[PDB]
């Protein structure tokens, strides 16, 4: 077993993201050192077994850090992860990291598990281009531990058909969806999506996107948006034959930066938003607004406009006390 470990640092935060295939975990502990040696490392964070991320605001941005993550089993096992760090790679030392093959840009995976090793990918978006590739395509596939880039922003990944798992993906540029479902379950586990929404078209981006119907999304691991976003989920509004249900489950997520709303349900078309261990930097009520209910319409026949925020129905199956500040 292994835990493939990478960092984001930004100008006011250093963002741990990590998939492993660990047994029976039941903790997780973070460590940080100030030097690349182990021996000398902190504990910083004592995390539940679910998660696969972490967001450190103690570091001093001026300076390099070295992190572990280590895993604990019921068995009384453990796991060390690689190390990750914000000083430059190793060219010596360093373990041996191999990425999958089929690991491109543009690639189409089908029907199984790619692991792409911490490798950067990225393809310039999709409605400024043609009939433009996402930047990896899952049909019933799973694909781990991916960073993507790209200047103005990358074209995102798309769950085409049949159940996606994408874990521990690093969005750094985002265009406007960092995944779009168009097929059953889509599952983000872990991951951090980047936006400073200062590079599509003025208009906000909708981090994860679900345009199948009778679809299901879910977010676990607690997935983190940073900078500036404009909707975390979204089933689409105008889709062509727009329809339901499009459903969405939060098991756990953090935003660390503003967002225009949580999650952009049609209540005329059925979908269920159900949330659960929600972080929002600086959250109060309405700030920003969490379960956003819409009317749903068909493309070229209209504006899909916002109701409203809600909590406890049918179609917003959230409480307050499932949204917290960070």
Same mark, same amino acid.
């Given at each position: 077993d292994d835990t493939m470990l990478m960092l984001l640092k930004k100008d006011n935060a250093t963002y741990l993201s990590w998939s492993t295939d660990a047994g029976n975990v039941v903790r997780q502990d973070v460590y940080r050192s100030?030097? =690349? %040696? $182990? %021996? +000398? =490392? /902190? #504990?910083?964070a004592e995390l539940n077994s679910s998660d696969r991320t972490f967001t450190d605001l103690t570091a001093n941005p001026q300076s390099d850090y070295w992190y572990w993550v280590d895993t604990v089993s019921g068995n009384n096992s453990v796991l060390k992860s690689n190390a990750a760090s914000t000083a430059p790679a190793p060219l010596r030392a360093a373990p041996l990291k191999a990425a999958s093959? /089929?690991? #491109? %840009?543009?690639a189409v995976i089908k029907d199984k598990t790619v692991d792409c090793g911490g490798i950067t990918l990225g393809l310039s978006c999709s409605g400024d281009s043609d009939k433009q590739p996402p930047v990896i395509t899952l049909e019933n596939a799973t694909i781990k531990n991916l960073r993507i880039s790209e200047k103005g922003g990358s074209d995102g990944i798309h769950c085409k058909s049949g159940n996606c798992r994408i874990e521990n993906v690093i969005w750094e540029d985002i265009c406007e969806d960092a995944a779009t479902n168009l097929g059953k379950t889509m599952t983000i586990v872990g991951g951090v999506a980047h936006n400073t929404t200062n590079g599509p078209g003025g208009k906000p981006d909708k981090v994860l996107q679900q345009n199948a119907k009778n679809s299901h999304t879910i977010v676990q691991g607690n997935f983190t948006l940073t900078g $500036?976003? +404009? #909707?975390?989920?979204? =089933?689409? +509004?105008?889709?062509?034959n727009n329809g339901g249900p499009r459903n969405l489950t939060i098991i756990s997520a953090t935003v660390n930066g503003t967002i225009d709303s949580i999650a952009g349900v049609n209540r005329n078309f059925g979908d269920v938003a159900e949330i659960r261990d929600l972080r929002i930097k600086g959250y109060k009520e309405g700030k920003p607004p969490v379960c956003e209910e819409f009317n749903g319409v068909e493309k070229g026949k209209g504006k899909s406009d916002k109701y409203g925020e809600f909590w406890d129905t049918k179609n917003c199956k959230v409480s307050r006390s499932n949204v917290k500040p960070l």
């Open positions: 100030t030097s =690349s %040696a $182990q %021996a +000398g =490392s /902190e #504990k910083i093959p /089929e690991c #491109k %840009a543009g $500036q976003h +404009g #909707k975390l989920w979204r =089933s689409c +509004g105008d889709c062509t």
